[PDB]
Amino acid sequence: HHWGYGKHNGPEHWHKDFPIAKGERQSPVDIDTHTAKYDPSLKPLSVSYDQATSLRILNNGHAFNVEFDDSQDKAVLKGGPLDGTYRLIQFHFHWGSLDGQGSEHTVDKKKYAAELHLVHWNTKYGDFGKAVQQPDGLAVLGIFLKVGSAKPGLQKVVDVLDSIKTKGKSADFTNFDPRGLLPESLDYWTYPGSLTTPPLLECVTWIVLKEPISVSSEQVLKFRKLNFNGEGEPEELMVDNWRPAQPLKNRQIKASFK
Numbered sequence: 656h657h658w659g660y661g662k663h664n665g666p667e668h669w670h671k672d673f674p675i676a677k678g679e680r681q682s683p684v685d686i687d688t689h690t691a692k693y694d695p696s697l698k699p700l701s702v703s704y705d706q707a708t709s710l711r712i713l714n715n716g717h718a719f720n721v722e723f724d725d726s727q728d729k730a731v732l733k734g735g736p737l738d739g740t741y742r743l744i745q746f747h748f749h750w751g752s753l754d755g756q757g758s759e760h761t762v763d764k765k766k767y768a769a770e771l772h773l774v775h776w777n778t779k780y781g782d783f784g785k786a787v788q789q790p791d792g793l794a795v796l797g798i799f800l801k802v803g804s805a806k807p808g809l810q811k812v813v814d815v816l817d818s819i820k821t822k823g824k825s826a827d828f829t830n831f832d833p834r835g836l837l838p839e840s841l842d843y844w845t846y847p848g849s850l851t852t853p854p855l856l857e858c859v860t861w862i863v864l865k866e867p868i869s870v871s872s873e874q875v876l877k878f879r880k881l882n883f884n885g886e887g888e889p890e891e892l893m894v895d896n897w898r899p900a901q902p903l904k905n906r907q908i909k910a911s912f913k
């Protein structure tokens with residue numbers, strides 16, 4: 656009876672195995688744009704992805720991850736609200752069964768069709784497993800997807816999903832450039848939060864970009880053909896793998912822009 660997104664093991668049940676689900680800095684949250692505070696001391700984001708080395712794409716049974724070589728400072732995030740250098744380790748998405756839902760964060764209660772998470776870890780802790788035990792261990796860049804025109808930089812991801820349809824399948828996935836997934840503007844909101852899947856650790860500085868990227872209906876439709884289950888098990892479509900918004904409690908969301 657492992658955790659998942661179904662009726663009997665979904666997010667409303669996670670607190671029984673992971674009691675930090677009712678913690679003080681859980682994610683995602685609703686971003687109220689009128690009570691976010693403009694902070695003029697926030698620095699612009701520095702995204703340095705020109706030497707990124709992708710390695711593999713994997714269906715882990717709740718999402719698919721594109722994994723990167725994080726043994727050197729090749730694809731790093733700096734600046735913004737961060738102190739120090741954060742290395743890119745993987746990205747993944749959350750999406751819905753319908754275009755009107757799928758994102759984890761919401762903006763004035765508005766849901767997007769999907770949400771991209773680029774996960775980075777603080778190099779001063781030496782490896783990802785150590786970083787997740789620290790309050791400043793991870794920085795996650797969150798990008799909203801809306802349905803409209805196609806995103807050409809996403810198509811290489813879409814076309815290999817047939818090869819990793821079921822849980823535990825992986826495929827070689829080299830020379831993918833994550834710069835093709837970024838919007839034009841890097842204006843952002845930021846707040847302290849958590850991983851949005853178990854173990855739900857409160858180790859994340861969230862950086863949520865204001866500008867969504869557009870993807871086509873055909874692109875998101877191919878996300879919905881993946882399976883939660885392993886091969887040879889009954890088919891359950893991988894859809895609605897998003898956690899609902901959690902209470903903000905004693906946190907303030909800051910904005911880099913007026």
Ligand SMILES: [Zn+2]
Nearest residue numbers: 747749772851
């Ligand atoms: Zn995520």
